[PDB]
C-alpha cells in the first residue's frame, strides 16, 4: 500500500492546484478522520456542443494496492446508459485495462478526460451494456434524446 498512497497524495495535490474547470475528484473520509486516499468521489461534466451538454455524471474511482502498477476501477454511481458502460456502472476502456493500455504514468486527470471523451464518441467493437448497444446500431436519434434526457436528469 505504501507505494500507492504516496503517489495519490501527490495526485490530489496537483489536482487541487489545477484541474479542467468543472470536474470533481476528492478522496473520501474514513469514519473518524482519516483520510481514505484509495477511494475517490469524482464527477464529469459532458463537453458542450454535444447531446451530453448540460449534465454532470458521477463516478466512484477505486484504487488497488498495486496502483500505479494496476489501474483504478471506475464505476458510475448510479449505472449509466452508455454502450461502453457495464450495467453495474464500471467504465470499460483500453487505458483502464491492466494488461492492455494502462500505463503507470497515467494521471487521474487524464483518466477523467479520457472518460469524458468516451462519452459522446463510443467504442462500437467493445460493448458493455446490451440495451445501449442495441440502440446505437439502428436508430441513433433514440439514443440521442436518451442522452439528452439523461443529462437533463443531472442538475448543473
Amino acid at each position: 500500500s505504501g507505494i500507492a498512497l504516496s503517489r495519490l497524495a501527490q495526485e490530489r495535490k496537483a489536482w487541487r492546484k489545477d484541474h479542467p474547470f468543472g470536474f470533481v475528484a476528492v478522496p473520501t473520509k474514513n469514519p473518524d478522520g482519516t483520510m481514505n486516499l484509495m477511494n475517490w468521489e469524482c464527477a464529469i461534466p459532458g463537453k458542450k456542443g454535444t447531446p451530453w451538454e448540460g449534465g454532470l455524471f458521477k463516478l466512484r474511482m477505486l484504487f488497488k494496492d498495486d496502483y500505479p502498477s494496476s489501474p483504478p476501477k471506475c464505476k458510475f454511481e448510479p449505472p449509466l446508459f452508455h454502450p461502453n458502460v457495464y450495467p453495474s456502472g464500471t467504465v470499460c476502456l483500453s487505458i483502464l485495462e491492466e494488461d492492455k493500455d494502462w500505463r503507470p504514468a497515467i494521471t487521474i486527470k487524464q483518466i477523467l478526460l479520457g472518460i469524458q471523451e468516451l462519452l459522446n464518441e463510443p467504442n462500437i467493437q467493445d460493448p458493455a451494456q446490451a440495451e445501449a448497444y442495441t440502440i446505437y446500431c439502428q436508430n441513433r436519434v433514440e439514443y440521442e434524446k436518451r442522452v439528452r434526457a439523461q443529462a437533463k436528469k443531472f442538475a448543473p
Partner: protein, 199 residues
C-alpha cells in the same frame, strides 16, 4: 551522389579511419549506404569535462550543396549542453553555420564538436533552459550534464543526490526519461518537477 563530393567523403572517411584520434578512440566515423548521403559519427566526451567517459552517436547528413554548404550534424545520443538541444540533438556550433569553410574535413568537424563540449557558448544558445541553468548555476549545470553523460552516453556514475530523486519519482510510477527531463528542467526541486510530470 555527385562524383566530386563522393570522392571527398571516401578520402575523409579514410583520413578518420587512419587518424591518431581514432586509434586513441576519441572519434570514429562509419558509412551507411553506397550513396554517401549519410555517415555515422562517434565522439568521446573530452577529459576534465562533465562528459568525460561518455560516448556520443552522431547523425551526419551530407546535403546536395556540400562542400559549399556544411554537413548536417545532429546528436543521436541525448546530451545536456547549452549549445545542443537536449530534446532533438540539434546543434549550434559556429563551424556548421557561418564559420563553415569547404576545406573542413569530417575529422576537423568531429574534433570541433569535442571542443564545443569543453567550451560552451551560453551567450549563443540552442537550449534556453540549459543555457540559463549554466549561467545562473554552474555547479548544478556540471552535475546535471554529468548525470546525462552517465545515463545516455555510458559515463561512470553520477551524484547520489540526483539519482535518489530519480528512483524516488520512478518508484512513484513515472517514466524515467520523463522524470530525468523534469528534474533537469525544474532545477532538481522535487515539488515543481512533480507538478510538471502530472501537467
Amino acid at each position: 551522389m555527385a562524383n566530386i563530393a563522393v570522392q571527398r567523403i571516401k578520402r575523409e572517411f579514410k583520413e578518420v579511419l587512419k587518424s591518431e584520434e581514432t586509434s586513441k578512440n576519441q572519434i570514429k566515423v562509419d558509412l551507411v549506404d553506397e550513396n554517401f548521403t549519410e555517415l555515422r559519427g562517434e565522439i568521446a566526451g573530452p577529459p576534465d569535462t562533465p562528459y568525460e567517459g561518455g560516448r556520443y552517436q552522431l547523425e551526419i547528413k551530407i546535403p546536395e550543396t556540400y562542400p559549399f554548404n556544411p554537413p548536417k550534424v545532429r546528436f543521436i545520443t541525448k546530451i545536456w549542453h547549452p549549445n545542443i538541444s537536449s530534446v532533438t540533438g540539434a546543434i549550434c556550433l559556429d563551424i556548421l553555420k557561418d564559420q563553415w569553410a569547404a576545406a573542413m574535413t569530417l575529422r576537423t568537424v568531429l574534433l570541433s564538436l569535442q571542443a564545443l563540449l569543453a567550451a560552451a557558448e551560453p551567450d549563443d544558445p540552442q537550449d534556453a533552459v540549459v543555457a540559463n541553468q549554466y549561467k545562473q548555476n554552474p555547479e548544478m549545470f556540471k552535475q546535471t550534464a554529468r548525470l546525462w553523460a552517465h545515463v545516455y552516453a555510458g559515463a561512470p556514475v553520477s551524484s547520489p543526490e540526483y539519482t535518489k530523486k530519480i528512483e524516488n519519482l520512478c518508484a512513484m510510477g513515472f517514466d524515467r526519461n520523463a522524470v530525468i527531463v523534469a528534474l533537469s528542467s525544474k532545477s532538481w526541486d522535487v515539488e515543481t518537477a512533480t507538478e510538471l510530470l502530472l501537467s
